[PDB]
Amino acid sequence: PQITLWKRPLVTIKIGGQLKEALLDTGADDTVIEEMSLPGRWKPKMIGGIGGFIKVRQYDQIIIEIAGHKAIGTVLVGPTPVNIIGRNLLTQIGATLNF
């Protein structure tokens, strides 16, 4: 698809058996999801941006279906105000910015 930017680029994802709405975010290095359980090992991480830092749990090798496209990678879980699909998974679905 071609997604214009007149509105926020929100899509449906499936993660950990759950459907969520998430922002396709070229400004985010990694994917960050609101609090949920995921299986397997994790380790703590701090991530920063406008307004400072939050503590998250880093889960590696997590499968996510993004607008119907499967990808695997790291998912950070923590108190993000918005679910964000970052570059680490945008690359895997072949997302590009075009102008």
Task: Return residues touching Na ion (CB under 5 A).
Answer: 40, 60-61
To the query of whether residue 60 is one of the catalytic residues in this protein, the response is no
Number of residues located near its own copies, criterion CB under 8 A: 40
CA–CA dist 16, 97 (Å, integer): 28
| Binding flags for its own copies, 20-59, as an x/- string (CB under 8 A) | ---xxxxxxx--x--------------xxxxxxxx-----
Residue 60 contacts which entry, its own copies, Na ion, ligand Y9R, none (Cβ below 5-8 A, type-dependent): Na ion
Element (H, E) at 90: helix 87-90
Contacts of 55 (CB under 8 A, 6+ apart): 44, 45, 46, 78
